[PDB]
């Protein structure tokens, strides 16, 4: 499942660097150039979403009270509910990833960095395994980069 | 103080329309040309700010615990703090007016409509009485309309 592996690599890398505050120079292994531009786009757009909704996100995280690995399945349930109206678009997708990055920052703060990888896999699972055909029709991460292109 | 009267009229009308949910056709009285387009712009931009920050605003309103007329002056204190870095721009101003409308909606919900006018006056007081020179340099509400032109 190349699409899952590529997607996990991008989302995992973004959540990791957000939680640590450091952009890893390690090259993308399973993303093939398109992933590099996607991560670059996700940094710009994902960071802006977090700045726009930081206080809202804090309240959501508090209500969810995610403290360990078995709580990540609540973010999975939330994402399923988001898409339950049958609508899919990149704004929704990148808002969920950005909330994921916000949660990862919190997990690192409370010495729960081990939960960041399972969090990323949970997010990628919903995206790729329930929205596969839509992603493929958008040409995957290339469509993501094009959609958020800055003039 | 024409600038105060013009500004109060715009902000008062917007807060009241939001609280009741009904766009009044009553013409603006002391706002001239800029006033008509300003309320139109404030409706578009202000409604979008509230959509963008509804949940954050709800939490803010909860922490402030505004229940009656004495509590209304806390928004003016919040506005003073917002501008304490010496920076002024229309995004800040409209975000504060939009939160004011969000509060006005709440006041109506708890049968405190009498507090909406004092809230509008407190907002207008901070804007006009502490940022007068900046407003005049921006060409007042005409600059507001141009800045947010679509």
């Amino acid at each position: 499942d190349d699409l899952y592996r590529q997607s996990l690599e991008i989302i995992s890398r973004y959540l990791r660097e957000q939680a640590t505050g450091s952009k890893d120079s390690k090259p993308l292994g399973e993303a093939g150039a398109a992933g590099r531009r996607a991560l670059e786009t996700l940094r710009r757009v994902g960071d802006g979403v977090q700045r726009n909704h930081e206080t809202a996100f804090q309240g959501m995280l508090r209500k969810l009270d995610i403290k360990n690995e078995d709580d990540v399945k609540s973010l999975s349930r939330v994402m399923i509910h988001v898409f339950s109206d049958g609508v899919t678009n990149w704004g929704r997708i990148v808002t969920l990833i950005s909330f994921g990055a916000f949660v990862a920052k919190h997990l690192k703060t409370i010495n729960q960095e081990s939960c960041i990888e399972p969090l990323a896999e949970s997010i990628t699972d919903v995206l790729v395994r329930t929205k596969r055909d839509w992603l493929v029709k958008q040409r995957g991460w290339d469509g993501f980069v094009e959609f958020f292109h800055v003039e | 103080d024409d600038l105060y009267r013009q500004s109060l009229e715009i902000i008062s009308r917007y807060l009241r329309e939001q609280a009741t949910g009904s766009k009044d056709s009553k013409p603006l009285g002391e706002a001239g040309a800029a006033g008509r387009r300003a309320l139109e712009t404030l409706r578009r931009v202000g409604d979008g700010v509230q959509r963008n920050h509804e949940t954050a605003f709800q939490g803010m309103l909860r922490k402030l615990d505004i229940k009656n007329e004495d509590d209304v002056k806390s928004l003016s204190r919040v506005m003073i703090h917002v501008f304490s870095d010496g920076v002024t721009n229309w995004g800040r101003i409209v975000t504060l007016i939009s939160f004011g409308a969000f509060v006005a909606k709440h006041l109506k919900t708890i049968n405190q409509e009498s507090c909406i006018e004092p809230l509008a006056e407190s907002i207008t007081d901070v804007l006009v009485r502490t940022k007068r020179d900046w407003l005049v340099k921006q060409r007042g509400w005409d600059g507001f309309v141009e800045f947010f032109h679509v």
Binding site: - | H81, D85, V87, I93
Partner: peptide
């Protein structure tokens, strides 16, 4: 008073500046 009002102001200031930048761009 001072403490919650100051934190709320910082949030509104941030929101205000993020929004301003989408039109001043």
């Amino acid at each position: 008073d001072m403490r919650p009002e100051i934190r709320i102001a910082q949030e509104l200031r941030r929101x205000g500046d993020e929004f301003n930048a989408t039109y001043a761009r």
